[PDB]
Amino acid sequence: SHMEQLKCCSGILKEMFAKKHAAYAWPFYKPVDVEALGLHDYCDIIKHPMDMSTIKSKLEAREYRDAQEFGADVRLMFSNCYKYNPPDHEVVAMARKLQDVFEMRFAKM
Numbered sequence: 001s002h003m004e005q006l007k008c009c010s011g012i013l014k015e016m017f018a019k020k021h022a023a024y025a026w027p028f029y030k031p032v033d034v035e036a037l038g039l040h041d042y043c044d045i046i047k048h049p050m051d052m053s054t055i056k057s058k059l060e061a062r063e064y065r066d067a068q069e070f071g072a073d074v075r076l077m078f079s080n081c082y083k084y085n086p087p088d089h090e091v092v093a094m095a096r097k098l099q100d101v102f103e104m105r106f107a108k109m
């Protein structure tokens, strides 16, 4: 059921925003501020930017037909981090930690 799926998707994103995962989930809360120092080339490398607040708004505006469409945006957010940043950057390790939380929840639904 697509309706039951999207309510579970809202639940997964709720845990991702919770205090428990806050230590590594904070860089993915809001869209990447391209006006900040060191992020002048972000728009040149990342063509489709995605973050948790945009996903939350897209769920509320019913922009996802099913769980797979929600999952695609969550993975786009992580893939943007892996593409733009160097492999040894701290944000890449944080992305892996938050993706572990998502992948385990997304598989068990």
Ligand SMILES: Cc1[nH]c(-c2ccccc2)cc1C(N)=O
Pocket: 026, 027, 028, 032, 033, 080, 081, 084, 085, 091
């Ligand atoms: C995903 C991501 N978030 C941030 C960030 C930086 C400062 C404050 C809030 C978010 C940077 C990146 C990145 N370098 O990819």
